[PDB]
Design an enzyme around this catalytic site. Structure first.
Site, PDB file in Angstrom:
ATOM      1  N   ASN A  29      -8.635   1.731  -3.365  1.00  0.00           N
ATOM      2  CA  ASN A  29      -9.410   0.634  -3.924  1.00  0.00           C
ATOM      3  C   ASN A  29      -9.673   0.842  -5.408  1.00  0.00           C
ATOM      4  O   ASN A  29      -9.605  -0.110  -6.196  1.00  0.00           O
ATOM      5  CB  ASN A  29     -10.724   0.485  -3.163  1.00  0.00           C
ATOM      6  CG  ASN A  29     -10.514   0.235  -1.691  1.00  0.00           C
ATOM      7  OD1 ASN A  29      -9.675  -0.575  -1.302  1.00  0.00           O
ATOM      8  ND2 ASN A  29     -11.273   0.938  -0.858  1.00  0.00           N
ATOM      9  N   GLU A  55      -3.380 -17.601 -21.029  1.00  0.00           N
ATOM     10  CA  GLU A  55      -2.157 -17.211 -21.715  1.00  0.00           C
ATOM     11  C   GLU A  55      -1.084 -16.695 -20.772  1.00  0.00           C
ATOM     12  O   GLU A  55       0.098 -16.966 -20.996  1.00  0.00           O
ATOM     13  CB  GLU A  55      -2.449 -16.134 -22.762  1.00  0.00           C
ATOM     14  CG  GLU A  55      -3.309 -16.586 -23.919  1.00  0.00           C
ATOM     15  CD  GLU A  55      -2.620 -17.614 -24.787  1.00  0.00           C
ATOM     16  OE1 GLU A  55      -1.379 -17.562 -24.905  1.00  0.00           O
ATOM     17  OE2 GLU A  55      -3.325 -18.459 -25.375  1.00  0.00           O
ATOM     18  N   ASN A  99       0.802  -1.217   0.000  1.00  0.00           N
ATOM     19  CA  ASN A  99       0.000   0.000   0.000  1.00  0.00           C
ATOM     20  C   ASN A  99       0.836   1.269   0.000  1.00  0.00           C
ATOM     21  O   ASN A  99       0.338   2.316  -0.425  1.00  0.00           O
ATOM     22  CB  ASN A  99      -0.939   0.018   1.205  1.00  0.00           C
ATOM     23  CG  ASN A  99      -0.218  -0.247   2.497  1.00  0.00           C
ATOM     24  OD1 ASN A  99       1.006  -0.367   2.522  1.00  0.00           O
ATOM     25  ND2 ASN A  99      -0.968  -0.335   3.587  1.00  0.00           N
TER      26      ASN A  99
HETATM   27  N1  LIG Z   1      -5.037  -1.293  -0.049  1.00  0.00           N
HETATM   28  C1  LIG Z   1      -5.830  -1.394   1.012  1.00  0.00           C
HETATM   29  N2  LIG Z   1      -5.472  -2.213   2.057  1.00  0.00           N
HETATM   30  C2  LIG Z   1      -6.274  -2.316   3.136  1.00  0.00           C
HETATM   31  C3  LIG Z   1      -7.457  -1.609   3.204  1.00  0.00           C
HETATM   32  N3  LIG Z   1      -8.051  -1.898   4.377  1.00  0.00           N
HETATM   33  C4  LIG Z   1      -7.274  -2.775   5.048  1.00  0.00           C
HETATM   34  N4  LIG Z   1      -6.164  -3.034   4.293  1.00  0.00           N
HETATM   35  C5  LIG Z   1      -5.057  -3.936   4.637  1.00  0.00           C
HETATM   36  O1  LIG Z   1      -5.386  -4.701   5.778  1.00  0.00           O
HETATM   37  C6  LIG Z   1      -4.276  -4.784   6.641  1.00  0.00           C
HETATM   38  C7  LIG Z   1      -4.752  -4.940   8.078  1.00  0.00           C
HETATM   39  O2  LIG Z   1      -5.428  -6.170   8.214  1.00  0.00           O
HETATM   40  P1  LIG Z   1      -6.925  -6.337   7.658  1.00  0.00           P
HETATM   41  O3  LIG Z   1      -6.946  -7.202   6.425  1.00  0.00           O
HETATM   42  O4  LIG Z   1      -7.498  -4.977   7.360  1.00  0.00           O
HETATM   43  O5  LIG Z   1      -7.742  -6.997   8.872  1.00  0.00           O
HETATM   44  P2  LIG Z   1      -8.201  -8.531   8.822  1.00  0.00           P
HETATM   45  O6  LIG Z   1      -7.686  -9.234   7.593  1.00  0.00           O
HETATM   46  O7  LIG Z   1      -9.702  -8.615   8.911  1.00  0.00           O
HETATM   47  O8  LIG Z   1      -7.563  -9.166  10.146  1.00  0.00           O
HETATM   48  P3  LIG Z   1      -8.374  -9.039  11.524  1.00  0.00           P
HETATM   49  O9  LIG Z   1      -8.432  -7.583  11.920  1.00  0.00           O
HETATM   50  O10 LIG Z   1      -7.676  -9.838  12.597  1.00  0.00           O
HETATM   51  O11 LIG Z   1      -9.774  -9.560  11.320  1.00  0.00           O
HETATM   52  C8  LIG Z   1      -3.498  -3.503   6.420  1.00  0.00           C
HETATM   53  O12 LIG Z   1      -2.116  -3.743   6.518  1.00  0.00           O
HETATM   54  C9  LIG Z   1      -3.846  -3.098   5.008  1.00  0.00           C
HETATM   55  O13 LIG Z   1      -2.773  -3.396   4.149  1.00  0.00           O
HETATM   56  C10 LIG Z   1      -7.821  -0.787   2.160  1.00  0.00           C
HETATM   57  O14 LIG Z   1      -8.872  -0.158   2.216  1.00  0.00           O
HETATM   58  N5  LIG Z   1      -7.005  -0.682   1.061  1.00  0.00           N
END
Ligand SMILES: Nc1nc2c(ncn2[C@@H]2O[C@H](COP(=O)(O)OP(=O)(O)OP(=O)(O)O)[C@@H](O)[C@H]2O)c(=O)[nH]1
Ligand SMILES: Nc1nc2c(ncn2[C@@H]2O[C@H](COP(=O)(O)OP(=O)(O)O)[C@@H](O)[C@H]2O)c(=O)[nH]1
Ligand SMILES: Nc1nc2c(ncn2[C@@H]2O[C@H](COP(=O)(O)OP(=O)(O)O)[C@@H](O)[C@H]2O)c(=O)[nH]1
Ligand SMILES: Nc1nc2c(ncn2[C@@H]2O[C@H](COP(=O)(O)OP(=O)(O)O)[C@@H](O)[C@H]2O)c(=O)[nH]1
Ligand SMILES: [Mg+2]
Ligand SMILES: [Mg+2]
Lengths: 439, 58, 108, 430, 430, 430
Positions: free
Chosen positions: A228, A254, A206
């Protein structure tokens, strides 16, 4: 008759798809409710929209996707939002107890009671299809829930379907800015999980997207909704050729035969250009010569890696709009003749050129301006080693003091597994170095 | 670093198979005396005389 | 090699200045009709480009729209006669009846 | 009477066939719906060569179209002239070749040839006396070369006394269009030389190069590319279809253009072709045409003829012309350029005369010559191939569908052997 | 038959060539819109001398247009009568000469002259029997002095039999257009003498002097100057286009005018010329034309003959006339001015007559001068060159592009050598 | 029969002989092991000129390696073709020369030069009848110029009838290597002028200029430069090892180039030398050989010969070709550029033809000529030296090894006379 099934797991995956499906919704004119707004739609040979949407016998369409998460708030958000009527009511599976950033929780203890339903639902979707090409998997590596349910679902895929082609857009935490403090642990454990069970994956840390967005749109304060949309752009590009008329075509099947030289090395980083806001938009030419250069520029990398330190392996190019063959031929001619970018001694020709005709659409209230020439790039370069080493360092330091290890032994996961994963990551680093040497 | 001379001028083009490369003209020009039957029609001698030079030239 | 300044003044007529030759110089007269004929053609189309000059490069050539039987009839180019809109779903597939199989025959 | 069934496969195959029919369609004056509107009697007398018979007087082409993915075929049906082909000849897969030769030659290709091989035999038996075939495909493309080569291989085993032809497009290292092009391009010829009596190499680079400095149109498209090849394809059969002074069938070209059975590669070029702006500033006399045919530039072949040393070549003129200047010039160019021709093949040029010019002109030239320069493509095609093999790079895909390493090396030896012969048949004196 | 060629380079070359082509089109009956609207059948009898034939009866001039700057090609093409020229004859670069000789013969020209040679060779060989080349260029300018001269050497080396023509506008110290004029011009004379068989210098300052005095026009412009030269060289080639009582060709002119190979420098003129005031008050007979021909101010070069002595001079009359008057007048001028003609060669004047004069006059005369007065022209430039070179002013540009001061010193020595060897005969006596 | 010997003094002699014995072996066809692998019989016909026979049929290059530095000498042994030298000839000191003439000519070198004298004498009797010595050394380096010359000084002492030849690489101004440059080059000529019968100076920059202009190689290496001479060395003695129309041993060249006894310095150059990307076209016909031969740019010596006049010329055509163009072009070139050829030696160009040219060509020529140009080479070096003396800097080393002020002065007057005596005949008139 060509169809694909998308898989998004985890909160981050849940939202990222939201933006992508908003783009996908507007591309084929489907109304937000699910009914054709034109009211002039005719039958016969107009079912070019089967790639993502499917007729429901009477009226609306259902997006052939599944949302899986263990935390209810995010999933319920889409349920009561404006997009309520679109999704199938039972295809948005929801959990009860959150994983809570514990990779052990999401893959040995709670995760095993939700994967069973997930496989069943995918069974319903695939059977309806007729020419299934492959899957697209999005996941958030830097989380316990994302990795576990994100990983375990993958292995189950390796045995029930078999040889079906599959791709994943993982998101490894940033080199210097990251949310979770336990991100390195489940991240490395994931590295094993997908290394020998996924064919292709693209790095989308990110931090770069903030860098790319800051330097193009002039916006200083992007939100996660902004990030997003751009990812929604790349997904549209990688699959666009499959579903529109063109002179030169590349399909999902491909890519797996022109980007992965060996089974072990299956990582590559993507880039996008041009990304010009409305203000700066007009005052250029967006000529192919200038556009093609911007793509290779280090400033646009969507994974925090600089190709200059190392060599390239194979690059795939997909154009869209009113590009012409001469414009492309000169551009590739120019790039090779330069000196800043250099290739390995064992890849004489490594460019796969694709051409489409439908211009990309602009999402309402977004940031990307309206342009006619564009480039979606997915390059596998030896330089990708930087991502793991930086992560390589962070994992070892914790273990030496055995900090936080005890919640990883609190769900039954053996202490030895950590030893196994560390070895495999070492092997992957070894292989990346070896391919880049001269004959 | 390519040690020693590492000469790479390649003054000669090379790859030229001059099967007559090392044939001293002092030899053939005086001692060919081939074919040229005792024909009387001057042209018949003319052509056969016409060919011998070309082979000598090449 | 000169500017065609057409005016009454005898020092800037050119025409009144290039009649010392043996005969009627073939140059001024042929040049004049060019300015007149171009105006009529423009009136047929309508350009009024603030002067006849902005229209004086590409209203005299004789390259016909069709060949003169000296090259393949490839035309001016496929892209030359191409009209394009830029709305969504314009270039969607058609799936002609040739490959429009519905029943998937089972027996060979 | 010596009708030839035309078969092409592959995306690159479809477009060439997709438009090539346009040129032949306009020559005999057949409309889009299949109703004749000719002006003279001759244009319909010898029409059995390419067209069958049908009710209502409508004529359908004896074409077989083959491809493994739906995108290519469907588009060609939607465009103009797309209604001539009958729906029966169509045959298509449901999976896709994936730019992997083996996926197109052993697993996916094999499990569909039964259907395609059935239609081809039906067309052959239909003719009164088959005269030959003619195939256009892509060596660097998957579906074209994938199962395209295999069909050619089987056909030879069934019809030995017939004549075979090929219009193969092999990528040039100037503009790359596929990372794996060296592999599928290098191993296809091996199955090609042993089975193809005649092969004519045309590289897209030459087609693009000809556009700028011949026609001078600012922006070329694929549509321009097909048309230039389309006419040249007619040159080989130009005299075969209409009356002429010195007829020449397909075999006659074979008899006078194959020094040895293992040298069956030529290059085709078309003249005249003058730019739009030079439409009216040229003379359509024999002297002007002869310069264009033998010029190093006009040949659509990546290999420059001037580095080479010609063995044999042919000329196929069109339109009403005298015989002095067709013959007398042929002597002059050869004599003044004897430094570039074999010295042990006297009178090594073939001339033919046919008296029906292409629609819109009065003279044309179709040249198909065999110059030792054609070795240039193979040397560069293999050269890049070797760099990609020493590391076993990208080799894992090819080992997952039944092929072993034995075929790869064995094919490599065959190509290298072909390269050697060209040089040997040049650096010798009587 | 006896056809020739024209090569024009540089801005001045293009201007003069365009004017000459306009005049020739007028004389022969060629219209911009190319079709034939000439009346007399005599014009089309030999129109092949300066024109080919093309499909559609549209005539094309066998000219060559070349230059290193785009405007000159674009400007002449845009203007009327520039549409006759063959676009394929257009060749040019995008750098520019910038008044640098080395830029015109060593660095840029070598890269672009390859294309030009091919066009000239093909066009020349096209015709049946050549007669020579007449080239228009400038020595005081950048492009003309170098690009044309390099072309001169190659063409002469390739074709050692046919004679050549050159039109050079040397600079004079009265009116100057470049601060480095002496260098590129001075070096020009060094190379041109060894190859150019015939050279007929032209001096601008004489143009203004002739324009102001005899014509008396208040405001003359470039069109006025360029027009005259077209008349002179159109008349020099009159008998070769039209019949006459005594035809005289190019080779005839050189043979009767050049005693030794190193003395091949001429000066020309035109007549009759009348001011707008007194056009209709004077007649058309051999007396008046012959009287005006030898006048000091009627010549076309800065040299004044009255300080020198003619060696050989030929008159190419036009139109009908009484021959005895032609002979009588020539002798009278010869006898009354024995001091101005050297003695050891008797009958040092030639004559010729043609049956068709230029449109719009009963008769006209074209005169070529070979007299010792040409020594002064070279001397003055030599004076400037030494002064500019002693301090090596402006020398760094030419030293920084591969040239060597050895070549400059050799050229400066050569000019003095020719000056001395040419002035020797003025005092030399039998 | 009529054999010579090789004495290389120093690394320059080490490398120059390092490659030349590498280049020659191919010409006569000797493998790295000294085993014959040739094709024709002639190649061994005169292989005895440089090689000696031993048990086992292996050949031996009769060279003796001399120097005062062990670091460089051994390097050649580890490299390829360095084993052609027998270890017995290996003679070397232990301390070096330190770029100081005296330390290499009076104290140290004189101490060890005895041993090389025995071996050098020993090699003499081995041959049937000695023919001469050709020695390569360096004047700009101490070791070669320190004890080298002393070797040359006495060699002629024991064989006052045999002649000796020298390759000299003299300091040039643009790029300098040693601060003892003024001294070592200056005095050293004093012994060489009265000792060497033939001296052929060569300047290093010319290689760069030759390699930068005609070779166009972006990055030359000492190996590349060594090669240029290696061919050059083969040009002088080329006609000494095979048949020929007019065989010219080292004697004939000696009698045809020296006008007077004190002038034994020559300037040479090799050609043709095509560029790296030389396109395969045409053939190096005779006409182009002459032109490139006399180009001032190709001459190896820094002094441009056009600054003076040629005393005489010698050329050695290589390959099979008639001499009429040799007779004419050699004659033709003299007439055109007679401004540079002296008077009282009519017909001042020699001709020689050999039938064994270097591998990979058809014709070639090596140029050897003596012209007053070298005056600049010794002059400018003279100025550098003259500024050094009154300067009286860096003399304490030279005054601390047994010599004093008297020795230095005498040479300078000798060379000051040499420069003067070289210029007296330049202006002489017949
Ligand atoms: N690019 C992007 N990454 C996001 C976004 N929201 C969350 N993330 C990613 O999610 C990571 C944090 O973990 P999450 O996936 O959000 O939370 P989770 O997978 O549900 O894990 P738990 O909180 O334990 O349930 C961050 O490091 C971000 O990289 C977003 O809106 N855009
Ligand atoms: N010149 C030209 N080349 C074409 C055209 N269509 C395809 N090609 C070539 O075909 C190659 C791709 O072929 P591909 O579609 O992969 O073949 P397939 O896999 O057998 O269907 C490209 O490298 C192009 O050079 C065309 O219309 N013109
Ligand atoms: N008489 C005449 N001389 C001209 C004309 N135009 C240019 N010149 C002369 O040409 C010279 C310039 O030469 P130039 O065209 O710059 O040479 P280039 O740089 O090599 O192209 C000037 O000294 C002018 O005297 C013209 O219309 N008439
Ligand atoms: N042409 C040429 N000259 C060389 C080479 N190596 C050295 N030199 C010249 O030799 C001079 C110095 O010689 P030096 O090193 O003192 O010889 P050494 O003392 O015996 O090793 C320099 O001025 C160089 O120009 C070479 O490889 N080629
Ligand atoms: Mg969460
Ligand atoms: Mg002798």
């Amino acid at each position: 008759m060509r169809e694909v099934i998308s898989i998004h797991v985890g909160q981050g995956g849940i939202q990222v798809g939201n933006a992508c499906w908003e783009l996908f919704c507007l591309e084929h004119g489907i109304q937000p409710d699910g009914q054709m707004p034109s009211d002039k739609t005719i039958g016969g040979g107009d079912d070019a929209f089967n790639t993502f949407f499917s007729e429901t016998g009477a009226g609306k369409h259902v997006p052939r996707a599944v949302f899986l998460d263990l935390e209810p708030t995010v999933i319920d958000e889409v349920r009561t939002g404006t997009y309520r009527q679109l999704f199938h009511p039972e295809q948005l599976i929801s959990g009860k107890e959150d994983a809570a950033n514990n990779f052990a929780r999401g893959h040995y203890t709670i995760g095993k009671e939700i994967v069973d339903l997930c496989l069943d639902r995918i069974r319903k979707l695939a059977d309806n299809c007729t020419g299934l090409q492959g899957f697209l998997v999005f996941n958030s590596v830097g989380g316990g829930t994302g990795s576990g349910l994100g990983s375990l679902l993958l292995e189950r895929l390796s045995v029930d379907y078999g040889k079906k082609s599959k791709l994943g857009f993982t998101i490894y935490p940033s080199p210097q800015v990251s949310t979770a403090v336990v991100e390195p642990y489940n991240s490395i454990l994931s590295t094993h999980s997908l290394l020998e069970h996924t064919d292709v994956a693209v790095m989308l840390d990110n931090e770069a997207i903030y860098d790319i967005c800051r330097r193009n749109l002039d916006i200083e304060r992007p939100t996660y909704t902004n990030l997003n949309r751009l990812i929604a752009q790349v997904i549209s590009s990688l699959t666009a050729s499959l579903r529109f008329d063109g002179a030169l075509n590349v399909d999902i099947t491909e890519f797996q035969t022109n980007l992965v030289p060996y089974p072990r090395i299956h990582f590559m980083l993507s880039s996008y250009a041009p990304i010009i806001s409305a203000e700066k938009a007009y005052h250029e030419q967006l000529s192919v010569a200038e556009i093609t250069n911007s793509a290779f520029e280090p400033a646009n990398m969507m994974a925090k890696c600089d190709p200059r330190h190392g060599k390239y392996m194979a690059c795939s190019m997909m154009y869209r709009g009113d590009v012409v063959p001469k414009d492309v031929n000169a551009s590739i001619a120019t790039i090779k003749t330069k000196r800043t970018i250099q290739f390995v001694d064992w890849c004489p020709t490594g460019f796969k050129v694709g051409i489409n005709y439908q211009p990309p659409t602009v999402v309402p209230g977004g940031d990307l301006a309206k342009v006619m020439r564009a480039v979606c790039m997915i390059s596998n370069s030896t330089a990708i080693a930087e991502v793991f080493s930086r992560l390589d360092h962070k994992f070892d330091l914790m273990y030496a003091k055995r900090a936080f290890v005890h919640w990883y032994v609190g769900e039954g996961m053996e202490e030895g597994e950590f030893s196994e994963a560390r070895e495999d990551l070492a092997a992957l680093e070894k292989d990346y170095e070896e391919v880049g040497i001269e004959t | 670093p390519q040690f020693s001379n590492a000469s790479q001028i390649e003054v000669g083009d090379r790859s030229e198979v001059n099967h007559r490369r090392f044939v001293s003209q002092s030899k053939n020009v005086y001692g060919n005396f081939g074919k040229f039957d005792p024909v009387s029609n001057p042209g018949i001698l003319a052509s056969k005389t016409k060919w011998h030079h070309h082979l000598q030239s090449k | 090699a000169e500017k065609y300044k057409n005016e009454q003044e005898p020092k800037d007529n050119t025409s009144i200045q290039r009649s010392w030759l043996p005969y009627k110089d073939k140059a001024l007269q042929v040049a004049e009709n060019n300015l007149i004929k171009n105006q009529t053609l423009n009136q047929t189309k309508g350009f009024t480009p603030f002067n006849p000059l902005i229209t004086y490069k590409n209203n005299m050539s004789q390259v016909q729209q069709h060949d003169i039987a000296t090259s393949l009839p490839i035309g001016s180019g496929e892209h030359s006669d191409q009209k394009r809109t830029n709305q969504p779903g314009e270039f969607r597939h058609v799936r002609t009846d040739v490959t429009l199989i519905r029943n998937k025959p089972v027996t060979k | 009477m010596r009708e030839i069934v035309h078969i092409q496969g592959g995306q690159c195959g479809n477009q060439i066939g997709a438009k090539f029919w346009e040129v032949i369609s306009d020559e005999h004056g057949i409309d889009p719906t299949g109703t004749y509107h000719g002006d003279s009697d001759l244009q319909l007398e010898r029409i059995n060569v390419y067209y069958n018979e049908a009710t209502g007087g409508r004529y359908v082409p004896r074409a077989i179209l083959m491809d493994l993915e739906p995108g290519t075929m469907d588009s060609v049906r939607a465009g103009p002239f797309g209604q001539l082909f009958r729906p029966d000849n169509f045959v298509f897969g449901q999976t896709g070749a994936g730019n992997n030769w083996a996926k197109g030659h052993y697993t996916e290709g094999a499990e569909l040839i039964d259907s395609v091989l059935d239609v081809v035999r039906k067309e052959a038996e239909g003719c009164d006396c088959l005269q030959g075939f003619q195939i256009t495909h892509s060596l660097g493309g998957g579906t074209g070369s994938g199962m395209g080569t295999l069909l050619i291989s089987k056909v030879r085993e069934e019809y030995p006394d017939r004549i075979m032809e090929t219009f193969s497009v092999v990528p040039s290292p100037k503009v790359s269009d596929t990372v794996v092009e060296p592999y599928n391009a290098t191993l296809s010829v091996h199955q090609l030389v042993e089975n193809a009596d005649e092969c004519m190499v045309i590289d897209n680079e030459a087609l693009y190069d000809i556009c700028f400095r011949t026609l001078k149109l600012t922006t070329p498209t694929y549509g321009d590319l097909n048309h230039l090849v389309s006419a040249a394809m007619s040159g080989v059969t130009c005299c075969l279809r209409f009356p002429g002074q010195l007829n020449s069938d397909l075999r006659k070209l074979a008899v006078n253009l194959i020094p040895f059975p293992r040298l069956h590669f030529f290059m085709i070029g078309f003249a005249p072709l003058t730019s739009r702006g030079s439409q009216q500033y040229r003379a359509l006399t024999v002297p002007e045409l002869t310069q264009q045919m033998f010029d190093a530039k006009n040949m659509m072949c990546a290999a420059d003829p001037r580095h080479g040393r010609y063995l044999t070549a042919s000329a196929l003129f069109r339109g009403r012309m005298s015989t002095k200047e067709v013959d007398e010039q042929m002597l002059n160019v050869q004599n003044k350029n004897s430094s570039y021709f074999v010295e042990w093949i006297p009178n090594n040029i073939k001339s033919s005369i046919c008296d029906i010019p292409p629609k819109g002109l009065k003279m044309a030239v179709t040249f198909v010559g065999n110059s030792t320069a054609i070795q240039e493509m193979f040397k560069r095609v293999a050269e890049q191939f070797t760099a990609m093999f020493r590391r076993k790079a990208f080799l894992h895909w090819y080992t997952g569908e039944g092929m072993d390493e034995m075929e790869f090396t064995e094919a490599e030896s065959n190509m290298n052997d072909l390269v050697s012969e060209y040089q040997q048949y040049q650096d010798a004196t009587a």
